[PDB]
Design a binder for these strands. Structure first.
Ligand SMILES: [Mg+2]
Ligand SMILES: [Zn+2]
Ligand SMILES: [Zn+2]
Ligand SMILES: [Zn+2]
Lengths: 171, 84, 177, 551, 112, 97, 270
RNA sequence: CAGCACUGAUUGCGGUCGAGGUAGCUUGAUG
């Protein structure tokens, strides 16, 4: 799943920062505007690999003010989920509707009806949980889900995941 | 397409339009508080300083000359001759 | 934004965007056949957990190093060592990355850039598409029916037996906690 | 420019793809149904009916709302609306092609009247250049008036080959007003080609035929020269105009639409009631009429489609037409800020590159200098000076994007400039400027001078530079434009300055010399016969500012 | 021989007035009218029909009409026309803009 | 005052590229619209506050740009539309040459 | 119209005159690559005059007591009289100036020698003259190789087109030709010594400026030559304030319109 | 750009030059 994609950004520099160590300021800029971002086109851009050889190429000066625009060609590590994907994580929350699991930077939620029959939700339990003849899903317990669908949104991505299928559940 | 430093074919001199625009652009930056690479012998008018920078060929810029077909040749202020 | 090395002349009619699934049909942005900046083709890059834990770290550390070249002028263990390395080379607002280290550090199935190596040399010879070659190496697996089920894109592709061999050896080279 | 940050990227325009609107798109774009012809008055009450101008489109009354897009008047461009017609209608200007089309393809089955099979044809389909590859097709299809079913191939003129078929005679066609007619040849048989019909025959045209004929599969399909849905330009294109309040102000356009609207509904209310078959095409022609005149109005078929008061009306085409109109009038040439004009007079005391600006003008025109350590000092003195003493300024602007009006502000005397703020100051001795005299037909008709602030109300220029702008002082008026960007200036001072203009390329000779007094006199003084004595040879020397101080 | 003629015939109009103009200009006009095939007029009939962009031929004697048949057969504009840009409010590939300018961060360090 | 065609004609002659852009824009119309990277139109519903964008119909939200053009022109376009003509505004060339 | 019809034309970085399509209109603006501003009227001496006068001016024969350079000219002259290896260069010089003559007479049939050309040579010397205080008495110090050999190396540096190949480096010659004729015309050995006593120092000097001032007379990739052209025809069309045939303002219109029915048809026959 | 302000002068009426026509006429250029 996780990825390593080759990307490229464009930053506009205002004359002021036209110093001896500009190369240095660009990079940092590149970082604050990419590390932590989100899109449906790329997923989560988590970290910029190889920091040393980041390409800045020659920068061209706009034409009304003195700013310059550089096309910074970098490389990084990304993560974008998929319907039909199978990943496992840690539960985090739980309620009369299901429990939310966490697969890395992302979170997959599971609907009460999108899990097994014989598994009921217990109200007065504390912390909240679901019980089975043999299973006990709750806070820490590590599960393993199947992402039935992915939904993009602002600065993140979410998904509904079932565990009704086989070989799924907790481990 | 891009052209290699060698095989270059344009005029080795600076077009009156280039220089006019370099002084301009340069000044603008200088007037925007950009850093100056020359000893200001006391000047205060940006275009003045600009002309000074251009006289000590210490302006960090590059003229990309586009050809009819789309390719282009790159020349630095440093390289070009400033006759005029 | 960020632009992804492929320019398709979007002539208005932007209607034909296919679905997504483990049918190996991933966005137009992840064809196995994808281009590298140099201008050449280069197979997709599938990172399996733990295999990423290192890349992130390796280049994250080298960042620390060089971040200073310019300043002169065990489960519950790596969990803290990693927390610091971040609070020194992270944007501090990258809650996404932190949380991505725990996960990446608790669920990792390996720990040596040697073992990981084997995994790779081993796995790669299958001809499997990078996505499989990752999931296969990041998901506990004992029975083919277990893998070829949690990874339906395999089915016809391999042979129940040999896969069982591979799986059988993974758990062997599976480093101990 | 426009103000307010936009988290959007910014690029320039490089390609402009021209095309026609697809009734499907028009519908897609809109945000307003637009079903009522009325303006607003929810029964006299003031606002707007979810009917015409603002059924969600733009806005009036200086109020946010632009489909929550708020921002208000200055920022919210228009938001198109549509208006489902009742029955297809031609497009005033395209009629001509639609005629040229049907003549190029027989109806009933819609397909070319000629193929590779006809030699005189091949040579036509080759011509790569739609524009000509059409007046080639059409020129060889208005003549064929039969939809042949079999043509002799390249073989024997004895052997016959087949393609498609249905020889229903090709009816020659003529333009009678806003409709099309054709006979079908003992004795003729005349009938009227219906819009609805025409559309269909086009709707079936082949994709390979499109192209053969001058079109494009995605940007312009012939089945679009016929209108179905009508896009409604939002207010900003047909702004209101209010005489305070309790009064109208509606733009010519807003009405024409309203006319098309009225003239639409009645042609529908008749298709669901007493529909006297041929007493409808007497009310449909009205729509094709309004919709036609809305766009073009000076049609050849006399009736101008007048409007109460007998004032012709302003078709859209009228707004873009020759000079004093959009294209040539607003885009190719504009009115502009930072300009001035008055009378010129001579002055044998300014250098060549100078120009006398009267304090009055000098106190109005302005330049934006950016506070920098190189001048904080200098600049602050101006801001204090205020906008009444000459060397002064009249507007300080902080990065925050807000204007300080030096002539009012309770902090006028106060203020402490900030490295980065701009200070619009008065033009001062030596601010280069573009000075000109119309008509402009010379490079030199416009040149750059060094400002020199003088008194009295006239632009002062040096004799010699007179023949270039070509001007006398018998009350001739001149123009001046003030630069604005450090880089702009440079452009004037580096290529537009006068000292540069001395030698002229339109005749490889200098285009400036000594004239009148200065000339006539230079001669007298020359003569051998002529001698000057000490008590004056000393004053003369003094006058030359570059004198080495050596008698 | 036509170009020769044409020029000869134009020069004589200016020469009859003691007016003088350096070859090159007239020669350019002569050439412009003569390239394509033979005699192409400096009028709404000729020069303003060629493959030049749309928005250009658009600012001269046939405005609306030209734009109509422009979208009709979906033209495309390069935006190389001086006019084109002016209409757009962008700097034109004109002298000062017949090239680009760039900051070579490299050399931007040797200067210190 | 007026910067007529003839005057334009002149600055083009001098090759005073930038100053011409200055007359025409910064000192007159000068305005900014939001475009779509697909249906090259002025459809975008730029809420410029909470950022939201969109050209439903071309249905976007991601590939949106913004140019700077003379309001006059904005109008020329809008008018050309109400007459059913599509003036597409694209920021990258494809035809090359 | 003259305007709108030529807007988009401008000189490009390859020294080609093109419009907005990319269409060549000229391959070298003006057919010479020179900027209208740097061009004065210069006379081409090599053209007019009796075949006799020509000989007496550019002919030098080191094998004839009456057609050599009196030792009062070239310092090292008495020791050249008769030299045979020289007379071969000295013969090339003449066999060229003559080739020139015939050429020019095939371009300017009128025999008109005054024309617009860059780099005013006449003055370039005049300065060299009083800039080195030359005395028409004492001899020179220019080798006969020196003269004839520098003049050759000079032409090799008057560059318009740069190109690294034949097609271009060929066009180069063309674009310079006429000038060089004027060049050899004035830097003729006889001339360079009997008419304007130049020293080695001086001569060397003249050559450098001719080279420099030339390079400065080229055109700048960037000029909007089209509009320039238009106006240049147009402005002089209003100063028109008015042996019997159609001529003037209405005739010009006749032209541009390319009308078939001109008021005056006429035609001349020889 | 003769002149008016009758219907909205951030523009109608109309005028002059030029072409086109069977004309009981279109406009291209034109404040
Ligand atoms: Mg007068
Ligand atoms: Zn709005
Ligand atoms: Zn048929
Ligand atoms: Zn869109």
């Amino acid at each position: 799943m996780f990825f390593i994609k080759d990307l490229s950004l464009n930053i506009t520099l205002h004359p002021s920062f036209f110093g001896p160590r500009m190369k240095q300021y660009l990079k940092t800029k590149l970082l604050e505007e990419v590390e932590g971002s989100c899109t449906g086109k790329f997923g989560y851009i988590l970290c910029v690999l190889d920091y040393d050889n980041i390409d800045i190429q020659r920068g061209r000066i706009l034409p009304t003010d003195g700013s310059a625009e550089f096309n910074v060609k970098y490389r990084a590590v990304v993560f974008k989920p998929f319907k039909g994907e199978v990943v496992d994580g840690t539960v985090v929350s739980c309620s009369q509707h299901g429990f939310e699991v966490q697969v890395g930077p992302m979170k997959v939620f599971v609907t009460k009806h999108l899990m097994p029959q014989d598994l009921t939700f217990n109200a007065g339990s504390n912390p909240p949980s679901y019980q089975s003849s043999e299973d006990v899903i709750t806070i820490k317990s590590r599960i393993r889900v199947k992402i039935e669908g992915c939904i993009s949104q602002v600065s993140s991505i979410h998904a509904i995941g079932s565990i009704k299928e086989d070989y799924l559940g907790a481990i | 397409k891009a052209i290699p430093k060698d095989q270059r074919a344009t005029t080795p001199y600076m077009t009156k339009y280039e220089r006019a625009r370099i002084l301009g652009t340069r000044a603008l930056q200088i007037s925007m508080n950009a850093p100056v690479f020359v000893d200001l012998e006391g000047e205060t008018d940006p275009l003045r300083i600009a002309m000074k920078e251009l006289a000590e060929k210490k302006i960090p810029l590059v003229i990309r000359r586009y050809l009819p077909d789309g390719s282009f040749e790159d020349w630095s202020v440093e390289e070009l001759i400033v006759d005029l | 934004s960020t632009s992804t090395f492929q320019t398709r002349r979007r002539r208005l009619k932007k209607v034909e965007e296919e679905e997504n699934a483990a049918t190996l049909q991933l966005g137009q942005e992840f064809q196995l056949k994808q281009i590298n900046h140099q201008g050449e083709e280069e197979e997709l890059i599938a990172l399996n957990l733990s295999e990423a834990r290192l890349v992130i770290k390796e280049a994250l550390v080298e960042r620390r190093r060089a971040f200073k070249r310019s300043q002169k002028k065990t489960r519950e263990k790596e969990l803290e060592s990693i927390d610091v390395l971040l609070e020194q080379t992270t944007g501090g607002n990258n809650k996404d990355l932190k949380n991505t280290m725990q996960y990446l550090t608790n669920f990792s199935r390996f720990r040596d850039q040697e073992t990981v190596g084997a995994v790779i040399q081993l796995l790669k010879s299958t001809g499997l598409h990078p996505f499989e070659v990752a999931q296969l190496g990041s998901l506990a697996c004992d029975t083919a029916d277990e893998a070829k089920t949690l990874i339906p894109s395999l089915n016809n592709k391999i042979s129940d037996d040999e896969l069982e061999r591979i799986l059988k050896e993974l758990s062997n080279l599976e480093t101990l906690y | 420019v426009g103000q307010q940050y936009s988290s959007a990227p910014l690029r320039t325009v490089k390609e402009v793809q021209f095309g026609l609107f697809s009734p499907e798109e028009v519908r897609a774009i809109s945000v307003a149904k637009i079903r009522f012809p009325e303006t607003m008055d929810e029964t006299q009450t003031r606002a707007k009916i979810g009917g015409l101008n603002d059924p969600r489109l733009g806005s009036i009354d200086r109020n946010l709302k632009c489909q929550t897009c708020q921002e208000g008047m200055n920022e919210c461009p228009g938001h198109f609306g549509h208006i489902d017609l009742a029955k297809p209608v031609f497009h005033v200007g395209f009629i001509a092609k639609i005629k040229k089309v049907c003549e190029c393809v027989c109806m009933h089955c819609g397909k070319l009247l000629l193929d590779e099979h006809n030699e005189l044809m091949r040579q036509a389909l080759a011509i790569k250049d739609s524009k000509k590859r059409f007046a080639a097709i059409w020129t060889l299809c208005k003549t064929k008036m039969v939809c042949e079913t079999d043509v002799p191939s390249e073989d024997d003129p004895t052997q016959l080959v087949s393609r498609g078929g249905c020889g229903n005679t090709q009816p020659t066609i003529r333009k009678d007003g806003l409709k099309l007619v054709g006979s079908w040849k003992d004795e003729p048989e005349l009938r009227v080609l219906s819009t609805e019909e025409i559309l269909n025959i086009f709707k079936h045209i082949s994709v390979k035929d499109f192209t053969s004929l001058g079109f494009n599969e995605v940007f312009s399909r012939p089945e679009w020269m016929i209108l179905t849905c009508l896009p409604v330009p939002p207010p900003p294109v047909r702004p209101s105009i209010s005489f305070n309040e309790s009064q109208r102000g509606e733009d010519d356009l807003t009405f024409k639409l309203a006319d098309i609207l009225k003239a639409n509904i009645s042609l529908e209310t008749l298709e669901h009631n007493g529909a006297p078959h041929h007493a409808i095409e007497e009310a449909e022609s009205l729509l094709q009429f309004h919709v036609a005149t809305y766009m073009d109005n000076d049609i050849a078929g006399q009736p101008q489609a007048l409007q109460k008061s007998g004032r012709p009306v302003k078709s859209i085409r009228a707004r873009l037409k020759g000079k004093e109109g959009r294209i040539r009038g607003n885009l190719m040439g504009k009115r502009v800020d930072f300009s001035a004009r008055t009378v010129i007079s001579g002055d044998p005391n300014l250098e060549l590159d100078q120009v006398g600006v009267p304090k009055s003008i000098a106190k109005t025109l302005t330049y934006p200098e950016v506070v920098t350590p190189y001048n904080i000092d200098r600049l602050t003195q101006l801001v204090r000076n205020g906008p009444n003493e000459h060397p002064g300024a009249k507007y300080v602007i902080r990065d925050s994007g807000d204007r300080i009006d030096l002539r009012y502000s309770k902090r006028a005397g106060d203020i402490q400039l900030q490295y980065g703020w701009k200070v619009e100051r008065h033009i001062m001795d030596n601010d280069p400027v573009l000075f000109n005299r119309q008509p402009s037909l010379h490079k030199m008709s416009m040149m750059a001078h060094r400002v020199k602030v003088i008194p009295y109300s006239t632009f002062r220029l040096n004799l010699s530079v007179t023949s270039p702008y070509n001007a006398d002082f018998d009350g001739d008026e001149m123009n001046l434009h003030v630069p604005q960007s450090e880089e702009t200036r440079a452009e004037l001072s580096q290529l537009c300055a006068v000292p540069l203009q001395i030698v002229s390329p339109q005749s490889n000779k200098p285009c400036m010399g000594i004239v009148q007094d200065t000339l006539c006199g230079i001669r007298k003084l020359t003569l051998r016969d002529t001698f000057i004595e000490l008590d004056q040879v000393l004053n003369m020397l003094y006058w030359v500012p570059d004198w080495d101080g050596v008698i | 021989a036509g170009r020769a003629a044409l020029y000869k015939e134009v020069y004589n109009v200016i020469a009859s007035d003691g007016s003088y103009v350096n070859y090159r200009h007239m020669a350019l006009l002569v050439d412009v009218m003569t390239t394509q095939g033979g005699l192409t007029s400096v009028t709404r009939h000729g020069f303003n029909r060629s493959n030049t962009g749309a928005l250009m031929r658009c600012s001269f004697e046939e405005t609306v009409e030209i734009l109509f048949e422009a979208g009709a057969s979906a033209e495309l504009d390069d935006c190389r026309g001086v006019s084109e840009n002016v209409i757009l409010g962008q700097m034109a590939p004109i002298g000062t803009g017949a090239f680009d300018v760039m900051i070579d961060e490299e050399s931007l360090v040797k200067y210190m | 005052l007026r910067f007529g065609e003839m005057e334009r004609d002149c600055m083009i002659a001098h090759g005073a590229a930038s100053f011409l852009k200055e007359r025409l824009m910064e000192a007159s119309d000068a305005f900014r619209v939001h475009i779509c990277g697909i249906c090259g139109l002025m459809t975008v519903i730029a809420k410029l506050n909470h950022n939201q964008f969109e050209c439903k119909g071309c249905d976007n939200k991601i590939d949106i740009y913004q140019i700077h053009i003379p309001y006059a022109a904005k109008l020329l376009f809008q008018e050309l539309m109400a007459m059913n003509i599509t003036p597409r505004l694209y920021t990258d060339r494809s035809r090359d040459f | 119209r003259l305007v709108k019809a030529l807007e988009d034309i401008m000189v490009h970085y390859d020294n080609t005159t093109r419009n907005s399509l990319g269409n060549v209109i000229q391959f070298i603006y003006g057919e010479d690559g020179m900027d209208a501003a740097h061009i004065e009227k210069q006379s081409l001496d090599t053209i007019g005059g009796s075949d006799a006068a020509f000989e007496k001016r550019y002919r030098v024969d080191l094998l004839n007591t009456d057609h050599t350079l009196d030792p009062s000219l070239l310092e090292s002259g008495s020791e050249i009289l008769g030299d045979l290896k020289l007379q071969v260069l000295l013969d090339e010089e003449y066999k060229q100036l003559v080739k020139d003559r015939k050429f020019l007479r095939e371009v300017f049939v009128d025999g008109e020698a005054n024309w617009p050309l860059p780099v005013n040579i006449r003055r370039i010397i005049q300065n060299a003259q009083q800039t080195f205080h030359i005395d028409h008495t004492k001899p020179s110090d220019l080798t006969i190789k020196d003269i004839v050999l520098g003049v050759k190396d000079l032409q090799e540096n008057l560059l318009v087109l740069r190109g690294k190949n034949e097609i271009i480096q060929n066009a180069q010659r063309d674009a310079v030709t006429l000038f060089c004729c004027l060049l050899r015309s004035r830097l003729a050995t006889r001339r360079v010594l009997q008419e304007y006593r130049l020293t080695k120092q001086a001569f060397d000097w003249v050559l450098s400026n001719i080279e420099a001032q030339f390079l400065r007379s080229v055109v700048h990739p960037g000029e909007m030559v089209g509009v320039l052209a238009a106006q240049s025809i147009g402005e002089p069309a209003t100063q028109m304030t008015l042996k019997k045939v159609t001529s003037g303002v209405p005739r010009l219109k006749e032209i541009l319109n390319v009308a078939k029915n001109m008021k005056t048809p006429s035609l001349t026959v020889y």
